[PDB]
């Protein structure tokens, strides 16, 4: 039923085929529900997606485009899978998209994705980004990896500026309210009791802290190993071992205020221990996209 | 009753005297109503406002500080007057704050503002910004002018990223919805009829367009001269003369999509003319701050 969200945030179309803006893509990432679909013929397509090299290929690429972009439903699901993918599966997905074995993804790979779309039953933005105007340009692994990390990082930045409310910093209330976004309302309100009572001022929460935290939340199942080890061993996880587990998982240290605030959040009982069960359950509810 | 908004968005205090963050200042600029006031003794004051030179003196200064700042009610009203001031009154207000005639504002000027506060009946952020830790540093006109324009420009940027929703561009719907913020609901909904019907796609609205437009909206009374000339002459103002009037007023050209979209907004009748009366009346309702 992921077609129905594409039905929701469509705003332009062509020959019965709904499209989106990059902005509608970003709203499908974040916003629940809001527009008017307008029609486009071929001259409109050229005037919109002309000049893709004008956009900078850094970490602001859809903000470099704004509305200048039309996204097929195949590209829509493709970018959603990029947003859901952990770091480890990069070269694996690249070689699965390397059917011809030529260390490359080609335009026939996207046409085979459209073959999948057809079995489930027009020049777009990423076609120009990775293959030029007609597909004559090629696509290697390094551009692919940089594109995936830039996309995820720009999503991190846009959520950061949403919940930080335009500042370069965050408070702990903003971090908790973002972190408890896809939680059920009763546990949310018990957590809000924990916010009102057990959370304090602390200090401002920076950008790289949130970036490392989002990098943590894309590696939850590999983090769950020592969790189930000391779960079936029934060792309630303290903060010092949690530091070691996070460092082994991500490869990067979180700051102590992150760990302190997380420990103030997920300790319902205040018993200096970890209820890892509800932690991991509502966390897997929380890091599921498409919603 | 401007004390009551200071009562609203206060979040820290000292000896019965409510303070704010820079973030609470920015929310008093934009947001209507939302926190918990917590107490601070002198060590808290030092630990908060230490290191003001760490913040960059460009156009992100409160975002460079975040929560690192405590704002007196005198400084609160002072910065609100800076946000309401047109460009022309700069040197005039500087010389009115130059009682000692020494081409400078000194700490006794702020103490005379506090004398005004007392007749209407503790080291703060701007004291360190303009005079150092104890007032021994001085304050000239150039820093004052740069501070006022950086403050106004950062407010422009924060509203831009609010209504643009994190993008580097705006649509015309965002520009209209920002522009019609302090309008009464019936005329607002007639304007929304005008949005749904007469507005089109156009193109993306950039940052410098919004900056020039806000610079226009701080010079409305000097813009009203030719308005009243062709009003008592009863010449309904067309767009071509409006270009000339805006260029004479601001000194900077607006782009044609700005003028086209404004002409699509304020032409209720569609009669290719200007209803300048409701324009200027609800515009003076719109550009009044403190709300």
Swiss-Prot record, chains A, B:
Changing residue 67 to R: Does not affect its ability to regulate the activity of MCU. Residues 85-120, 122-154, 185-220, 254-289 form the EF-hand domain. Its main location: mitochondrion. Keywords: Disulfide bond, Membrane, Mitochondrion, Mitochondrion inner membrane, Phosphoprotein, Repeat, Transit peptide. Changing residue 267 to A: Abolishes mitochondrial Ca(2+) uptake. The modification Phosphoserine is found at residue 118. GO terms for molecular function: calcium channel regulator activity; calcium ion binding; calcium ion sensor activity; protein heterodimerization activity. GO terms for cellular component: calcium channel complex; mitochondrial inner membrane; mitochondrial intermembrane space; mitochondrion; uniplex complex. The keyword Metal-binding does not apply. It comes from the Eukaryota. Changing residue 244 to A: Abolished interaction with MICU1. The keyword Zinc does not apply. Ca(2+) 2 binds at residues 267, 269, 271, 273, 278. GO terms for biological process: calcium import into the mitochondrion; cellular response to calcium ion; mitochondrial calcium ion homeostasis; mitochondrial calcium ion transmembrane transport; negative regulation of mitochondrial calcium ion concentration; positive regulation of mitochondrial calcium ion concentration. It is found in: Mitochondrion intermembrane space; Mitochondrion inner membrane. Ca(2+) 1 binds at residues 98, 100, 102, 104, 106, 109. Heterodimer; disulfide-linked; heterodimerizes with MICU1. Component of the uniplex complex, composed of MCU, EMRE/SMDT1, MICU1 and MICU2 in a 4:4:1:1 stoichiometry. EF-hand domains 1 and 4 have high affinity for calcium and act as sensors of mitochondrial matrix calcium levels. EF-hand domains 2 and 3 are degenerate. Calcium sensor of the mitochondrial calcium uniporter (MCU) channel, which senses calcium level via its EF-hand domains. MICU1 and MICU2 form a disulfide-linked heterodimer that stimulates and inhibits MCU activity, depending on the concentration of calcium. At low calcium levels, MICU1 occludes the pore of the MCU channel, preventing mitochondrial calcium uptake. This is Calcium uptake protein 2, mitochondrial. It comes from Homo sapiens.
């Amino acid at each position: 039923l992921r077609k129905q969200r594409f039905m929701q945030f469509s705003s332009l179309e062509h020959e019965g085929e709904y499209y989106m803006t990059p902005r509608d893509f970003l709203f499908s990432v974040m916003f629940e529900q809001m527009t008017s679909v307008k029609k486009l013929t071929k001259k409109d397509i050229e005037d919109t997606l002309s000049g893709i090299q004008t956009a900078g290929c850094g970490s602001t690429f859809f903000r470099d485009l704004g509305d200048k972009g039309l996204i097929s439903y195949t590209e829509y699901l493709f970018l959603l899978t990029i947003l859901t993918k952990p770091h480890s599966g990069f070269h694996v997905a690249f070689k699965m998209l390397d059917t011809d074995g030529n260390e490359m993804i080609e335009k026939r790979e996207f046409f085979k994705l459209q073959k999948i779309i057809s079995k489930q039953d027009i020049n777009t933005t990423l076609q120009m980004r990775f293959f030029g105007k007609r597909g004559q340009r090629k696509l290697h692994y390094k551009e692919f990896r940089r594109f995936m990390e830039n996309l995820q990082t720009e999503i991190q930045e846009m959520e950061f500026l949403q919940f930080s409310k335009g500042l370069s910093f965050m408070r702990k209330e903003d971090f908790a309210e973002w972190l408890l976004f896809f939680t059920n309302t009763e546990n949310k309100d018990i957590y809000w009791k924990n916010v009102r009572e057990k959370l304090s001022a602390g200090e401002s929460i920076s950008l790289d802290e949130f970036k490392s935290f989002c990098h943590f939340t894309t590696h939850l199942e590999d983090f769950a190993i020592a969790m189930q080890m000391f779960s079936l061993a029934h060792r309630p996880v303290r903060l010092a071992e949690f530091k070691r587990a996070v460092k082994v998982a991500t490869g990067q240290e979180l700051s102590n205020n992150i760990l302190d605030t997380v420990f103030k959040i997920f300790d319902l009982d205040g018993d200096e221990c970890l209820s890892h069960e509800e932690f991991l359950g509502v966390l897997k509810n929380r890091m599921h996209r498409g919603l």
